[PDB]
Amino acid sequence: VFLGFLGAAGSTMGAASMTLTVQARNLLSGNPDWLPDMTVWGIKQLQARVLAVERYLRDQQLLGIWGCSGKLICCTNVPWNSSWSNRNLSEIWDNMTWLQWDKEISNYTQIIYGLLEESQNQQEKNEQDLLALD
Amino acid sequence: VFLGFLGAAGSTMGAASMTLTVQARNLLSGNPDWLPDMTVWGIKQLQARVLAVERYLRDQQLLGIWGCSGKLICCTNVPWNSSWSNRNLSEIWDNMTWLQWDKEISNYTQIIYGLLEESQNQQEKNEQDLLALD
Amino acid sequence: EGQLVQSGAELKKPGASVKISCKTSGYRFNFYHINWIRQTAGRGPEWMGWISPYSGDKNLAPAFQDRVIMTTDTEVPVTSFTSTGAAYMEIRNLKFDDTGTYFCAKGLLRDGSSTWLPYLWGQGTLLTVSSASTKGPSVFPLAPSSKSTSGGTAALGCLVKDYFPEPVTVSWNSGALTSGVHTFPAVLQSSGLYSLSSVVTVPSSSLGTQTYICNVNHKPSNTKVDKRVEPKSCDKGLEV
Amino acid sequence: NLWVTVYYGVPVWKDAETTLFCASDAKAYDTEKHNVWATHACVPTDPNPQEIHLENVTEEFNMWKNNMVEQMHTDIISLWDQSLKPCVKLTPLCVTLQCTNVTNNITDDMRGELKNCSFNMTTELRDKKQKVYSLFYRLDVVQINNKEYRLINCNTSAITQACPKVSFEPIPIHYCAPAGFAILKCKDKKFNGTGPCPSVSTVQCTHGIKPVVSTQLLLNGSLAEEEVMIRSENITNNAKNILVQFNTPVQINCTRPNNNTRKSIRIGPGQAFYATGDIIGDIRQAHCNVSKATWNETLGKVVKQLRKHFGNNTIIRFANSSGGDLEVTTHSFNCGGEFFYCNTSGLFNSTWISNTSVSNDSITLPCRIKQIINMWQRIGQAMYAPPIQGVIRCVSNITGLILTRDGGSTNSTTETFRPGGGDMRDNWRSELYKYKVVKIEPLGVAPTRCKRR
Amino acid sequence: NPQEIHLENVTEEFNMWKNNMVEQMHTDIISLWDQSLKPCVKLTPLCV
Amino acid sequence: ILKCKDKKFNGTGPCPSVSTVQCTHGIKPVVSTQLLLNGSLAEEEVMIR
Ligand SMILES: *[C@@H]1O[C@H](CO)[C@@H](O[C@@H]2O[C@H](CO)[C@@H](O[C@@H]3O[C@H](CO[C@H]4O[C@H](CO)[C@@H](O)[C@H](O)[C@@H]4O)[C@@H](O)[C@H](O[C@H]4O[C@H](CO)[C@@H](O)[C@H](O)[C@@H]4O)[C@@H]3O)[C@H](O)[C@H]2NC(C)=O)[C@H](O)[C@H]1NC(C)=O
Ligand SMILES: *[C@@H]1O[C@H](CO)[C@@H](O[C@@H]2O[C@H](CO)[C@@H](O)[C@H](O)[C@H]2NC(C)=O)[C@H](O)[C@H]1NC(C)=O
Ligand SMILES: *[C@@H]1O[C@H](CO)[C@@H](O)[C@H](O)[C@H]1NC(C)=O
Ligand SMILES: *[C@@H]1O[C@H](CO)[C@@H](O)[C@H](O)[C@H]1NC(C)=O
Ligand SMILES: *[C@@H]1O[C@H](CO)[C@@H](O)[C@H](O)[C@H]1NC(C)=O
Ligand SMILES: *[C@@H]1O[C@H](CO)[C@@H](O)[C@H](O)[C@H]1NC(C)=O
Ligand SMILES: *[C@@H]1O[C@H](CO)[C@@H](O)[C@H](O)[C@H]1NC(C)=O
Ligand SMILES: *[C@@H]1O[C@H](CO)[C@@H](O)[C@H](O)[C@H]1NC(C)=O
Ligand SMILES: *[C@@H]1O[C@H](CO)[C@@H](O)[C@H](O)[C@H]1NC(C)=O
Ligand SMILES: *[C@@H]1O[C@H](CO)[C@@H](O)[C@H](O)[C@H]1NC(C)=O
Ligand SMILES: *[C@@H]1O[C@H](CO)[C@@H](O)[C@H](O)[C@H]1NC(C)=O
Ligand SMILES: *[C@@H]1O[C@H](CO)[C@@H](O)[C@H](O)[C@H]1NC(C)=O
Ligand SMILES: *[C@@H]1O[C@H](CO)[C@@H](O)[C@H](O)[C@H]1NC(C)=O
Ligand SMILES: *[C@@H]1O[C@H](CO)[C@@H](O)[C@H](O)[C@H]1NC(C)=O
Ligand SMILES: *[C@@H]1O[C@H](CO)[C@@H](O)[C@H](O)[C@H]1NC(C)=O
Ligand SMILES: *[C@@H]1O[C@H](CO)[C@@H](O)[C@H](O)[C@H]1NC(C)=O
């Protein structure tokens, strides 16, 4: 079910995964047309929609430095750690929201980015270079 | 044959497909250097070349949400509909321009984007997730 | 939507020359080759040659290498996709074997293995190579005839007789009548004469409400005959 | 058994503050008033407001720590400043004016204060100077000591005339959310202002808000839902204001009856000053009428909502203002171009029993008029209101109230709610209480069973 | 080097009286006059 | 920027000889009335638009 933009904010993470393109398509293009030339009021909203694309490109750089690159669902090779949210499957995807999920991960979220940027492409690329000659 | 930028605007779609990089490379970088600091005249052209990259990123988002992603030629899995331009092969690629093509498709063009964004990655990704565990 | 129009009918002598036009419309004249093919009853149809209005490249049959000369003007763009060009063809050394209907047509594709192939054909242009003279026709009316006694249908027409040059077109009431108009082909006399007829099936009750005038237009002789068919019948099956 | 996996486009937002947009309402091209409030820059409204209710979503809102109010305040301030920048300055008007009382002080028990001033102003040229007259109105000095006078506006800041071509009619301006961000709108009827909204929706563009500068009384505001709302950042603290939102609108009709005229006297090579001409016909003070039955019902409905906070079967009172600034002690607003300062001393004389209170078809309120305003927080500029040629009559819906409680040890006794105001932001919290700005963070991680290569 | 590239087989409908480049150049010339005369010497005391 | 190239141009209609550019040809901003000064010459024929 669609339910439009952010419709599954309180639904399960599994049901919320069914609407990734919906949340993705409405964040980048909130296009205001600034054809009228008004002096001091344009710089504020221009800075706003420029910092918007700066944050978007920061997220895209983070999603490119990883083995994942497709702006979609993707799998990695970094194992999940039992210290992070000691929960089984179906307990997460059927009785939890992405908000509470990021809240519980926020304690251990900072090292996961490092494990994804270094334990992967800093070694996966090097293995790709030393295993593509044969 | 090259014939430079937009050289094959009146040629066949097949011959025009031979110059995709030519039309692609000259649309993104029409770089003006705005080192001189002139007050009210910079905001107009700055808004212009910012809306340029906004439109470019809208096109890139549309070309990323689809199964296609390489900024090149690409094939999909959505079947062509006989209602859309009841024509055979070689009739299109050897006696038609991209202008007249988009003109004839403009009547049915709006639903093709939906068939490419939903009938593909809203199901192709989900099949990829449920067929990558074995 | 290319609606091409060729030239009119003309009469010539053997050993002389004649020039046939081929005016185009509704499509880009420089985007397609222009073919030229004849149809003579002595050897069937024969491809005469094609030409390229864009690149200026022509290609004739080796039998027509000396006597056929094809020219083209520059296209007159009407819209961004429409142009009105013209393709002329002069033929010399007229012989008895060069009598028939000639055609010009539009090329098929702009690229590929079959680019010049004739797709949109013109209406045609008939030529008769003869040393004889141009003689005007003799137009007579036709008495009405019964076609269905129980139905009540009359048949009246006009009779074009004894004309040597190209055939003739006939309208009805200045072209205001097309239902029932049925035109017969010409004859071939021992002296070389051509003669035909035309007819229309009119309602037997349509005798005091409508008037039927046939209009004969012989163009090579530049004559016109407007005849009024008398509504007084003479067939015993039609007076009822 | 299970591996980490990324998901892009998940419904995850975090509360943040960023620059917003503004709407042109789409009727801006047909107004053709050259420049209204925000007709200058805002973009036309989308054909369909994307209002999407989010089921199972409860979001904690806090209207008193909101940043949209600060954005709208700074935008209104810059609007005033950029609207008055290219207009006619009137710095040569700060001269000495030998004035005289009006020729009609009939029955001096009633008041009549318009000064037929005349003064030597600069003309088209710089060599000569011409004597003109007719500045009028109450705002002036008492002179240092036909009586001399001068402008206290000159005693404070510089003066500039408002452009006569622009208008002050509030156009419906609704803020919009940029790319990457969204606006959560609460939907339940009764809202505490601070707390969890159970019925939340999301939008980009808000609902139409009219920028109205008003004190003591909120005009042309958004109606409440079924119940009168009593919002406050801290109800115990006396210093914090008390906002009141009405269920039913209170009809008000304000009138400047002076069939007035104008005079265009040329000053400087390009400028031209609009002076208040002579009053043609009779004269009487501007006023505002409110139907007494509707006001009685509104007060009797608000007192029961106040008793929920300050006790059942108790008495509350409210007198007129305490004292201080003219803009704080008086209901100040604009209409047609003229700035009305009315005294609400005739509406707040009430004590309330547990069931009743302690004919008259309508209640009238006197109102003075002011043309030079120092309401700008920049005390370096002031605006001269151009005179309006003709009679002025403007109707409006009263929708809100701003009250202050008298402090002290008044527990065993009753409580008093005197009118007040001052801060412009309180005028905006009655419209942006249901809105919160959030930023989207669509990058999530979760464990599932899958393997690469 | 001015990149002037002729497009063969291309016929394009032009309309000079509905063009928007003229409006752009007009507004640019107006703003040019205005921004060129802004910081110069004013002569308002000359009106004598 | 599409630039027409044929000598005679009606001003309104289909240009048969089109080129493309980014930068136009040099135009001198001349404020003049009744008479155009330092303008671009026509091609072979006087134009009445
Ligand atoms: C603008 O528009 C015009 C008109 O539409 C285009 O002109 C046509 O161009 C196409 C090719 O681009 C032409 O198609 C070709 O005709 C060639 C003629 O051939 C040869 O022999 C003669 C001698 O008789 C020589 O003078 C001539 O130079 C040639 O050497 C064919 O050779 C071509 O065939 C090719 O393709 C087939 C594909 O099956 C291959 O098998 C062949 O080996 C060969 O590679 C081709 O058929 C066409 O005739 C032109 N005229 C028309 C359509 O009227 C312009 O090209 C176009 N320009 C642009 C920039 O768009
Ligand atoms: C404010 O003005 C309006 C309109 O002038 C008044 O509404 C009118 O009220 C009278 C008396 O009830 C009716 O006879 C009219 O039909 C009403 N007209 C309209 C258009 O509604 C309103 O009563 C005034 N309010 C006050 C407090 O004076
Ligand atoms: C999990 O994390 C802890 C501490 O962060 C670390 O000691 C341990 O090695 C990790 N285990 C795995 C399987 O990643
Ligand atoms: C969902 O339910 C299970 C079992 O009832 C429970 O263990 C789990 O903690 C619940 N999820 C949350 C986020 O509380
Ligand atoms: C083609 O389109 C029509 C209407 O848009 C639809 O009914 C039909 O199912 C489509 N067929 C295919 C093969 O997509
Ligand atoms: C190209 O030619 C073919 C056959 O001559 C014709 O059917 C087709 O409609 C032509 N293309 C266009 C766009 O007219
Ligand atoms: C007349 O003007 C003087 C000015 O000082 C004022 O004090 C007085 O009240 C006025 N009298 C009126 C308006 O009747
Ligand atoms: C004006 O005010 C004065 C008091 O200052 C009063 O004596 C006089 O009657 C009033 N009216 C006129 C017409 O002077
Ligand atoms: C005000 O004084 C002027 C003289 O300067 C006079 O012409 C005018 O009629 C007076 N107006 C009133 C209302 O007394
Ligand atoms: C509303 O919020 C305030 C916050 O201090 C709280 O004290 C109060 O109990 C809440 N409810 C009502 C009905 O005021
Ligand atoms: C206001 O005064 C002018 C001038 O005397 C008059 O023409 C006009 O009718 C008056 N206003 C009304 C509403 O009558
Ligand atoms: C309030 O009313 C009193 C009389 O009850 C009056 O003296 C006073 O001027 C009024 N205004 C203020 C601000 O107190
Ligand atoms: C206002 O309501 C009270 C309570 O019923 C009543 O005593 C009083 O007379 C009313 N005032 C009016 C009708 O003016
Ligand atoms: C409120 O709306 C009314 C529309 O009836 C309008 O006349 C008035 O100017 C607006 N503003 C105020 C402050 O009344
Ligand atoms: C006042 O409220 C009523 C009730 O909906 C509405 O019809 C009217 O337009 C409102 N007037 C103003 C000026 O807001
Ligand atoms: C040029 O365009 C106009 C457009 O109205 C048209 O009437 C005219 O026939 C065209 N040709 C010439 C030579 O003016």
mmCIF file of C-alpha atoms and ligand atoms in Angstrom, chain D residues 103 116 118 133, ligand 9:
data_model
loop_
_atom_site.group_PDB
_atom_site.id
_atom_site.type_symbol
_atom_site.label_atom_id
_atom_site.label_comp_id
_atom_site.label_asym_id
_atom_site.label_seq_id
_atom_site.Cartn_x
_atom_site.Cartn_y
_atom_site.Cartn_z
ATOM 1 C CA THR D 103 -12.707 75.278 14.075
ATOM 2 C CA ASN D 116 -4.677 73.046 11.437
ATOM 3 C CA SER D 118 0.876 75.515 8.526
ATOM 4 C CA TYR D 133 -0.642 73.554 5.720
HETATM 5 C C1 LIG G 9 -6.691 75.988 8.048
HETATM 6 O O1 LIG G 9 -5.928 77.195 7.883
HETATM 7 C C2 LIG G 9 -5.822 77.627 6.518
HETATM 8 C C3 LIG G 9 -4.919 78.840 6.511
HETATM 9 O O2 LIG G 9 -3.547 78.475 6.552
HETATM 10 C C4 LIG G 9 -7.214 77.911 5.953
HETATM 11 O O3 LIG G 9 -7.104 78.264 4.578
HETATM 12 C C5 LIG G 9 -8.109 76.688 6.106
HETATM 13 O O4 LIG G 9 -9.434 76.992 5.686
HETATM 14 C C6 LIG G 9 -8.121 76.217 7.559
HETATM 15 N N1 LIG G 9 -8.920 75.012 7.699
HETATM 16 C C7 LIG G 9 -9.763 74.811 8.717
HETATM 17 C C8 LIG G 9 -10.507 73.511 8.708
HETATM 18 O O5 LIG G 9 -9.917 75.642 9.606
#
